[PDB]
Design a protein around this ligand. Structure first.
Ligand SMILES: *[C@@H]1O[C@H](CO)[C@@H](O[C@@H]2O[C@H](CO)[C@@H](O[C@@H]3O[C@H](CO)[C@@H](O)[C@H](O)[C@@H]3O)[C@H](O)[C@H]2NC(C)=O)[C@H](O)[C@H]1NC(C)=O
Ligand SMILES: *[C@@H]1O[C@H](CO)[C@@H](O)[C@H](O)[C@H]1NC(C)=O
Ligand SMILES: *[C@@H]1O[C@H](CO)[C@@H](O)[C@H](O)[C@H]1NC(C)=O
Ligand SMILES: *[C@@H]1O[C@H](CO)[C@@H](O)[C@H](O)[C@H]1NC(C)=O
Ligand SMILES: *[C@@H]1O[C@H](CO)[C@@H](O)[C@H](O)[C@H]1NC(C)=O
Ligand SMILES: *[C@@H]1O[C@H](CO)[C@@H](O)[C@H](O)[C@H]1NC(C)=O
Ligand SMILES: *[C@@H]1O[C@H](CO)[C@@H](O)[C@H](O)[C@H]1NC(C)=O
Lengths: 348, 60
């Protein structure tokens, strides 16, 4: 208890029991560090707008109850991206857009005691109930003038359906790649592409429009590999996405590093190219015979890149293993090579 | 322990081939656990030397 509408609670919480929570919240030094916010009995909270939760980046638990909340802006939680428990029960909400919680990792979404009006705009919540999400099944939510949400008819409700047309085959560095995204569904609002930071691995030219969006990736580089190319579309029911990748073939490359002694020795290497190159060690120009004690071992590959790393491992090498280690790396483009001198034990 | 030694080994290789010394802090913490498990292990000196040798190249 404190002489403000909002009183701090715990290390990083705020509990607001009288009107004026939002004003009080935004006059609180350090409010950006709040991790829990409880709000009740507001008298002028018909709408929750984008700016109302501005700056509350650390918020994990948000409760707004008994406040006559009627309209939640689709971007009302843009400034609360870490929200994981959201309780909006006992308001006047007749509808709730799927956009409000999109992108949140909500463990809990509480909508009890609201006069929910069922329509295709509530199909997403029905899916959460179907899939056991957000603690929604236990609420047994109801369509206010009808029956339970679990029985809302839904034959006409659907997110857009997408088909992405991609090249079947790999391409070469410098090629132009055409992709297309075909979108179907009722009441389409928007569609487009999300291109995760290409880093200029392609020149991006969009063309056409609904229902067949066109994408040309021109003058591709090898770094277009592993990049997610996503087509998305949205209507009142929900959002659909399809992500694809393009394969850009490119020549082998190899590099060696100075030998380092650990419980085994390691000659570290990195290799790149696509198709992934085959590897062959030579020692003083002769093929090296890999054995139980001298063998190639790779680090686990990474999903976001084609380069591979590893070691030539040597368990207890002697002076006979002093000399010139060459790593050959070859794919359909030809053979690359790198060489390094290595010494392991003094001559007797 | 063999699993710890392989984890230090992989962290050091990663630091060499990526140039990222962040991997070396993990190798150091694992090395202190390795040393506690077996104070007579002669490999621990090699891991310590390897970690120092990698940090030298990465810093300069
Ligand atoms: C979502 O928020 C609502 C708030 O409307 C939560 O319902 C409320 O839960 C509290 C805690 O159990 C109840 O408080 C209790 O009040 C009695 C009064 O006698 C007291 O003796 C208890 O010790 C306790 O403090 C409150 O009555 C209740 N309000 C309503 C309208 O049901 C709800 O729990 C939240 N949902 C989730 C999943 O967290
Ligand atoms: C509160 O958050 C700010 C960043 O918004 C941060 O610089 C500051 O250290 C945080 N305070 C505490 C006590 O964690
Ligand atoms: C959010 O609420 C849950 C459930 O009461 C609690 O366990 C958790 O500690 C809360 N999170 C924060 C950051 O306070
Ligand atoms: C909601 O739609 C799904 C998908 O077609 C369907 O299987 C389910 O039966 C529908 N629910 C109701 C209550 O009609
Ligand atoms: C393709 O990209 C390379 C590298 O940026 C550049 O040198 C070349 O001129 C580009 N080709 C065209 C047709 O723009
Ligand atoms: C090391 O071996 C490779 C492959 O035989 C060879 O091309 C290179 O010239 C050799 N280096 C020296 C210093 O002889
Ligand atoms: C892949 O991810 C790792 C870890 O975030 C990063 O260090 C690396 O530079 C990334 N590589 C590419 C080619 O994006």
């Amino acid at each position: 208890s404190c002489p403000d509408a909002c009183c701090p609670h715990g290390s990083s919480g705020l509990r607001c029991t009288r009107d004026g929570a939002l004003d009080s919240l935004h006059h609180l030094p350090g409010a950006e560090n709040l991790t829990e916010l409880y709000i009740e009995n507001q008298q002028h909270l018909q709408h929750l707008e984008l700016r109302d939760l501005r700056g509350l980046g650390e918020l994990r638990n948000l409760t707004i109850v008994k406040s006559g909340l009627r309209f939640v802006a689709p971007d009302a939680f843009h400034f609360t991206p870490r929200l994981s428990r959201l309780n909006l029960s006992f308001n006047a909400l007749e509808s709730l857009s799927w956009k409000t919680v999109q992108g949140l990792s909500l463990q809990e979404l509480v909508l009890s005691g609201n006069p929910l009006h069922c329509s295709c705009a509530l199909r997403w919540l029905q899916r959460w109930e179907e899939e056991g999400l957000g603690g929604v099944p236990e609420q047994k939510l109801q369509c206010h003038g009808q029956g339970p949400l679990a029985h809302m008819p839904n034959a006409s409700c659907g997110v857009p359906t997408l088909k992405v047309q991609v090249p079947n085959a790999s391409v070469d560095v410098g090629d132009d790649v055409l992709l297309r995204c075909q979108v179907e569904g009722r009441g389409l609002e928007q569609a487009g592409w999300i291109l995760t930071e290409l880093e200029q691995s392609a020149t991006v030219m969009k063309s056409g429009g609904l229902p067949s969006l066109g994408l040309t990736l021109a003058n591709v580089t090898s770094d277009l590999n592993r990049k997610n190319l996503t087509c998305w579309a949205e209507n009142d029911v929900g959002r659909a996405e399809v992500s694809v990748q393009v394969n850009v073939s490119f020549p082998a490359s190899v590099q060696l590093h100075t030998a380092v002694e650990m419980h085994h020795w390691c000659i570290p290497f990195s290799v790149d190219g696509q198709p992934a190159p085959s590897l062959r060690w030579l020692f003083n120009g002769s093929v090296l015979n890999e054995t139980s004690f001298i063998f190639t071992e790779f680090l686990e590959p990474a999903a976001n890149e084609t380069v591979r790393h590893g070691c030539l491992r040597l368990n207890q090498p002697t002076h006979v293993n002093n000399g010139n280690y060459t790593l050959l790396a070859a794919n359909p483009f030809g053979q690359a090579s790198a060489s390094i001198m290595a010494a392991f034990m003094d001559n007797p | 322990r063999d699993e710890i030694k392989e984890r230090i080994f992989k962290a050091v290789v990663r630091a060499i081939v990526t140039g990222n010394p962040e991997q070396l802090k993990e190798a150091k913490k694992l090395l202190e656990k390795l040393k506690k498990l077996g104070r007579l292990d002669q490999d621990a000196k090699k891991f310590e030397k390897a970690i120092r040798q990698v940090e030298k190249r990465l810093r300069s």
